[PDB]
């Protein structure tokens, strides 16, 4: 039933108890239920040390990742070209699913094509679906660049990616001199990052491996910029403001802060802004190049410093107070700009804001995950701030990167209850919330599930879920924060101490029993 | 829009195709007309996407596992291949179930196998092998395991079916194996049809002569709702305030010991006809057990829908039946009598997957609004004629609609709202459309039923009526 | 007890059995409390229609009022002025408080002097404490100016300011040039706004009102802008920013962004930034002066058209989408600078965001508060939302400013169950908030009391605090934020959103009770 | 730093004075000598502020609504002039109380008469009958009443002790008229002598001839404790571990029937000298009650208050009194083998109201601080002939410090940390000097007692020992 003037939607309608009599029917006819009290006793037993054991036993099962795969990032990393569609070679249905992941993360439009390869092609390959492929898409969609990486079925088979693109143009399909870049990306190997790794490498590629006889490094005065799989547009944005505040000559190689956040002003724009070819025909004249997430750039950074011969800074990513005082101070030393008073003053507000909240983010515990480079940046900002990151978990990880997270922890007496966790995933960390409890996560939407898990154990159990980083797909706009720069730790550091004092403010809200801690100033 | 009008815009639209993505796009765009009611005579249905034209379309591992499979809530069903499916598919499709989460229900969690290159190299048969008794020791209470292929399964020559059995074997335990590599067929129809028959071959013929179950003359089984935002629960409440007895639901909460069970129903009530006509008709072959169609979009579907239904039983159903009418008409008069009038003669475009273009027509309609055009991801030509009997006259209709003709045909047609998925969203808004979701009803819900009615009409008021379409020109341009 | 490795503060240190036998005995023994059936049956009674009837006959006690007095107003105006000290003349208990209310807020050093009168004063005056007090102050806090105002015994008095200043020049106390612009502030009368208004009137005519002779409206090509009592860093900086990016000259008059954001940097800085004296001088020779909160600027109003003889446009405060519009229409027209297409893209990204979180914002129910131009913004946006503005409360309101609310409100759907309060305080709107319940409270810190209250009742009964307004004291840094433009609107946007959605997953986060709306994606 | 560099820094600093400034200020500051143990042979205090200095006191207000009156839970304490003064000060002190707020207890709301222009003319004794009457009505548990007169109401010739009188007798309620005005005294001292005047005049009395209450040997009072953070709890569980009954509080957590039942007690207990020596005085002048001063910051100071306060009673509490001593050894010492070795040597600075600065000393030699600096607001000589006992030799002490001195004064001496006020906290942190707050305890606590102090020994070691501390100058400067 529904009373007109105050409709319900499924929450709370399914709560009227004629619902409720129904689906106890339906448990008690049909279902076949475990009972209640073996629901609970089983529960429990996931919440134990002895489940731990077993569940960091795994070998073969995979529970709840905190990964995707490679052509995820390729697709993120062509979005960031001007006029570029991302084309993946192979299966449509990935697309489908990149498309809606990526919708889902910035409530924008994601435009990428298929070739939609199908059974049949197990016989004799993707040679025509590439030829079709082509040429449909530069008809329909007049993109001035399309940039292919592929889906597994087409990996499998062994696609030669580079024989069907020349074949597509000896044969007329498209112009020989139209842009097609292109990467092999296997899903099997490696995760998203990868796949954005090997698809700027492969522009990076088509666009100066046969072009470097007139290539001299420095003559255009730039500082060339690789940005990585960014799913926050304020971190683009912060960049390109540093630099342009220092009067730093700069080129951010994949762009897409424009193509991602276009207006609503009655035009569907396809494409906006982003890198464009002659920035990328041009890179090689830089001064240099920096990797803002070095830890999954490493076959571009082989590439820029064995044909661009760059040498590529020993840069962090710039998160936290040291890691961006040392990027600065690294663009200034290669551009010979100095650091202007403006950073300088931005810089001591963000000192100010640390000494403004010590004193409630002392001792914090937290549990988190991401990808590499934002994972130890993260750790980096939290020790600054006095936290402990008592469970670190990065999917996609590998061991020098625990390596190196794990000197950090070393480094600071906040590191001395911190494990990093590679290659374990959310039903690990799950555990690890149980077993050594901290007062908060910070992740990404699939923790809601384990803050969830902790609640129903009860609300002493509860861990609280902080959203940073990606997919976050419960909250709107968060896509526009930033997390890199001064910016960026102001936004993570307010978002912290707030998240204490909220959870604090729920915790003593109770009239008559905790509310004499219900203060007003905090 | 006249005919003319209509068949001109696809011609004009279809000049910025290559000669033979023009050629093949022309059979797949068609105007109703009442004189041409074989769908066969009209438009072509189920082929091959052509490259490069940006379709919506998934593959058959989102029908296998999404729909078919996925929301059975007792089962643990394993994402066989690299990580991407699973992760992408996790929790995106809202098939509500009661449960607990991690112990005895398993809907929105990610079981994988995670696939390296050197699963690739040796086979990942020994892994699954692996997998599943890793599965039996960390998650007791489930009640049996579906192996999702993804596409290296079948193209590296893997054999899930012999490790399904000997597994299934050794641990006394119900292991399906689903050959739904995403490279079969050509979308999720066919993903549909193969977790269609491994329900089939491995679940359905469990309780065959198994006769502990106490029947009755009323049970019936809901077949193809995936109970998106609650749809079947909203549905199953009024069959049985008709008296009926819904022993099982495909697969919306669904349970394994449900399916099961249904063989020993009256009557299969299909809602997804597209989805779940393959098992219906073998449980008439094998079992002798009457399918109807039915649809509970709106108060006249779904008054329709009971009145048809009960007609099957006898009179006591048929009294029960006018019994719930009676008591829902004023609900739904009130919905209609506060928001028909705020969205009469406003007009609407869809496009989805396989039923609801045809399927929500019914509903739009009681609120006095109208269906212009409407298209079909991967619909079959068995749905384009049923659709052209509940289109209108001269109305647009389009299957494996490209990115590019639905813009283009908005542009023309100027539509008041459009209907389609995630992928649609935000490039129509940004037009100034009204748009409203048609797969996740926007996470609003349940839209089945007479309670569904309401949110339904809420819903699209909402959004058409909203303040914002008023918005997006600046005033200085 | 402790244990020392986890050290509990008051919370949850009092929940220990120990204290709670001894804070049972204590009751018990010595407080003569009443009963806690009693207790309860007040407590029900204070949530009903006959209690609010009763609540709102009230015309002697105010209780939780939602406004300060008139020399809080004249401090942060004074504020805004390089290198000027606030002076308050009267009780230095007052400036105490002052400094105090805004230490709290902005986390910020807060300077401020008085000239400590007492007692003996109320015979005889305070001429002598303004002679040594202004004397003193040059000499040890170095001011280019000093801004006077006063405390309520000052005014009771009748201590007369302009001859008190005189007199100290005369004497010699301070030079004859040494700038002191004055302004009487009683407590007495209208709130902290007129005071703001009052004090920006008298530093204006200081500078200007013997000077007019030379003056030639529009010579100087620049636009004057007066601010208003404003608390959000982000407000000054919206403005700034985006007048700088139309190529607009301007001239912020009270600008003390720089001086509530000095950096930690091992320096404390007295002063920082500010309005400069020449930009006082010269803003009869602006083209035309722009009130951003007209509704608490009319004397000053009254000044710079009676006597700088500018035209002053008929703007509301800029807040949300057509207001926003409006003031930079309004803009452009004055100067002759065209929109650029950046801010038109800006306006276009707060539409798009408009139109991605419309479904979770629509019909939502708030009852708010704060001062009259903010709440009249914050209820435009609303309705711009589709939201509904239930209770909409102003304790310093007037009934033109009623007027103008309810004339905005009868123009949208979105206004009819709504209701303008002026002269009411905090706990006339608990009672709304319990006969009348909304969704969300927006307001600032006082309101976490009521959402209190309401849980008291029971969790289907609370209304969740959205903290935007002045003062927030429980959360860190908000005060940075931003409520002003298209870019205040996206902020506020994002917050209304996101609270929703945080209440949403609250509700539906039990274990097979609520947890089949716990939706991964929203 | 040698007396002789403090001397010559007391010089340099009050150079930039006017000579009227100069020679005032310079009787208010002193460098403490083991020789003179007399305050009025080398401090002034408890004199007016100079104008234009920038003092960090308050008002005779704060001092009677702030800490005497407010605090008591159960009375309704009206902030009777303009909105002000009742605004400022709504809940910025943390005097923790166990209530039902808005029903039995009302300490964190603001009641206000919120005077305007009308009611300075014609006063405002008709509106404070009437205000009287709807507090009645609105709040009916209330137990009690206090009118808290800000400045005006002294100025415009108001007469609100007949108001109390003949309002109370009319409600057979207690109405306590307090002359609190800002404009009286200096400081909030003259506040608390007002305040504690008032409890004497209108409420400790009224159970004189009461011989109902059922007494024991071991009953006292904790007098000036305002329960800042539990302050006053965490003191009150360890009196009562020793054998002792606490019959009433003063003010924290208090309430109306406690004060009245404090004339019964056999001994109060005076932590606050400054605020409740008034009212002590006069207990042992009417009762006969004897009072003592103690000091519950810090284990040295804790235990020998236990001691000397169990010395009062009989052997029985005096056994007691070494068994709570030997309960909490383990706890305390594990505190400081914690704690004071990541403390020892640091150098602190004070400025505090009218107790803490000399009170809190012991706490701080408990963990190796030396305080190489003190001061206080608003003390009198009997406070600085305290703390000269308490303060090594050739330390710093100010008496009403101005801004300008703290500053400069911390700038040379170049403190570890710094305990003050909110109006100070900011300023230091810019400087990159550590800063806890010594009010509010930087919204911390209870640092009183054994529980206490383990939590006063994180607070001091999280801020001077935090990383943020090293960040204050950028790399490249
Ligand atoms: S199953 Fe089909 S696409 Fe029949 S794969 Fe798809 S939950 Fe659609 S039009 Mo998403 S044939 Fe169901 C469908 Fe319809 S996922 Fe849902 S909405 S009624
Ligand atoms: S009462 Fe006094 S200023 Fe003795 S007015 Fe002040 S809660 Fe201070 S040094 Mo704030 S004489 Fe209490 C005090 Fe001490 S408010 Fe608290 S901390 S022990
Ligand atoms: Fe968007
Ligand atoms: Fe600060
Ligand atoms: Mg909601």
């Not at chain 2, 009530?269 to 109807?292: A, D, F, Q, T």
């Amino acid at each position: 039933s529904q009373q007109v003037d105050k409709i319900k939607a499924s929450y709370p309608l399914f709560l009227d108890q004629d619902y409720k009599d129904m689906l106890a029917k339906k448990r008690d006819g049909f279902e076949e239920k475990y009972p209640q009290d073996k629901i609970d006793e089983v529960f429990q037993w996931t919440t134990t040390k002895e489940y731990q054991e077993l569940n960091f036993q795994r070998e073969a099962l995979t529970v709840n990742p905190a990964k995707a795969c490679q052509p995820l990032g390729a697709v993120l990393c062509a979005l960031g070209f001007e006029k570029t569609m991302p084309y993946v070679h192979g299966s449509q249905g990935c697309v489908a699913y990149f498309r809606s992941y990526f919708n889902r993360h910035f409530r924008e439009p994601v435009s990428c094509v298929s070739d939609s390869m199908t059974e049949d092609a197990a016989v004799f390959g993707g040679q025509q679906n590439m030829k079709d492929g082509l040429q449909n898409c530069k008809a329909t969609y007049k993109p001035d660049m399309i940039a292919v990486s592929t889906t597994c079925m087409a990996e499998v088979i062994g696609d030669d990616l580079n024989a069907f693109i020349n074949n597509s143009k000896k044969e007329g399909f498209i112009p020989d001199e139209f842009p097609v870049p292109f990467a092999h990306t296997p899903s099997f190997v490696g995760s998203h990052v990868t796949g954005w790794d090997n698809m700027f490498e492969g522009i990076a590629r088509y666009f100066t491996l046969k072009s470097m006889d007139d290539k001299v490094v420095g003559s255009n005065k730039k500082i060339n910029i690789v940005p990585g799989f960014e799913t926050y547009l304020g971190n683009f944005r912060v960049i390109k403001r540093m630099l342009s505040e220092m009067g730093v000559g700069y080129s951010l190689l994949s762009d897409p802060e424009e193509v991602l956040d276009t207006p609503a002003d009655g035009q569907f724009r396809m494409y906006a802004g982003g890198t464009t070819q002659e920035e990328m025909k041009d890179a090689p004249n830089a001064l240099n190049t920096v990797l803002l997430q070095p830890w999954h750039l490493e076959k571009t950074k082989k590439f820029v410093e064995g044909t661009w011969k760059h040498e590529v800074p020993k840069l962090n990513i710039p998160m936290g107070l040291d890691w961006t005082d040392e990027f600065l101070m690294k663009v200034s030393e290669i551009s010979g700009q100095p650091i202007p008073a403006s950073l300088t003053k931005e810089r001591g507000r963000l000192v100010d804001m640390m000494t403004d909240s010590h004193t409630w983010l002392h001792g914090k515990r937290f549990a988190l995950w991401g990808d590499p480079d934002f994972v130890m940046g993260l750790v980096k900002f939290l020790l600054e701030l006095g936290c402990e990151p008592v469970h670190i978990l990065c999917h996609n990880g590998n061991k020098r990167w625990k390596k190196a997270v794990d000197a950090i922890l070393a480094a600071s007496p906040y590191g001395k209850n911190a494990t990093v966790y590679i290659g374990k995933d959310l039903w690990h960390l799950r555990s690890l919330v149980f077993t050594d409890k901290p007062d908060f996560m910070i992740g990404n939407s699939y923790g809601k599930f384990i803050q969830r898990d902790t609640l129903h154990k009860g609300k002493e159990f509860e861990v609280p879920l902080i959203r940073i980083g990606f997919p976050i797909f419960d909250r709107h706009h968060l896509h526009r924060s930033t997390t890199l720069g001064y910016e960026g730790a102001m936004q993570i550091l307010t978002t912290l101490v707030n998240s204490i004092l909220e959870r604090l403010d729920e915790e003593t809200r109770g009239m008559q029993a905790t509310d004499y801690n219900h203060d007003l100033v905090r | 829009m006249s005919r003319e009008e209509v068949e001109s815009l696809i011609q004009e639209v279809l000049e910025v195709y290559p000669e033979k993505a023009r050629k093949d796009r022309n059979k797949h765009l068609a105007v109703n007309d009442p004189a041409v009611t074989q769908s066969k005579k009209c438009i072509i249905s189920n082929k091959k996407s052509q490259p490069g034209l940006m379709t919506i379309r998934g593959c058959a591992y989102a029908g296998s596992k999404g729909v078919v499979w996925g929301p059975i809530k007792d089962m643990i069903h394993i994402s066989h291949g690299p990580v991407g499916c699973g992760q992408y598919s996790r929790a995106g499709q809202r098939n509500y179930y009661i449960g607990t989460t991690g112990v005895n229900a398993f809907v929105t969690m990610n079981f994988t196998s995670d696939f390296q290159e050197k699963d690739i190299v040796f086979g990942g048969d020994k892994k699954l092998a692996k997998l599943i008794d890793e599965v039996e020791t960390l998650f007791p209470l489930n009640k049996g395991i579906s192996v999702q292929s993804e596409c290296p399964i079948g193209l590296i020559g893997d054999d899930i079916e012999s490790v399904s059995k000997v597994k299934g074997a050794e641990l006394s335990k119900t292991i399906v194996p689903v050959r739904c590599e995403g490279f079969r067929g050509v979308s999720q129809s066919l993903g549909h049809h193969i977790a269609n028959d491994a329900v089939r071959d491995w679940v359905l013929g469990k309780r065959d002569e198994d006769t502990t179950f106490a029947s009755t003359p009323y049970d019936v089984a809901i077949i193809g709702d995936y109970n998106i935002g609650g749809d079947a629960w909203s549905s199953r409440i009024l069959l049985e305030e008709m008296g009926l007895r819904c022993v099982a639901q495909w697969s919306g909460d669904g349970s394994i010991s449900e399916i099961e069970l249904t063989p020993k129903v009256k009557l299969n009530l299909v809602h997804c006809y597209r989805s779940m006509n393959y098992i219906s008709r073998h449980m008439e072959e094998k079992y002798g057990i009457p399918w109807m169609e039915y649809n509970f979009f709106g108060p006249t579907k779904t008054i329709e829908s009971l009145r048809a239904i009960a007609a099957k039983f006898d009179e006591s159903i048929q009294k029960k039946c006018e019994e719930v009418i009676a008591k829902y008409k004023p609900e739904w008069e009130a919905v209609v009598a506060k928001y028909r009038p705020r969205l009469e003669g406003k007009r609407v475009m869809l496009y989805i997957g396989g039923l609801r273009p045809r399927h929500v027509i019914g509903a739009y309609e009681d609120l006095g609004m109208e269906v212009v055009g409407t298209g079909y991801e991967f619909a079959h030509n068995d749905d384009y004629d049923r659709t052209m009997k509940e289109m209108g006259d001269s109305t647009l209709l389009y299957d494996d609609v490209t990115g590019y003709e639905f813009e283009e045909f908005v542009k023309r047609i100027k539509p008041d709202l459009i209907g389609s998925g995630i992928k649609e969203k935000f490039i129509f808004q940004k037009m100034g459309i009204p748009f409203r979701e048609m797969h996740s009803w926007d996470y609003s819900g349940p839209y089945h039923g007479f309670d569904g009615f309401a949110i339904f009409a809420r819903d699209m008021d909402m959004t058409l009526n909203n303040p914002c379409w008023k918005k997006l020109q600046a005033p200085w341009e």
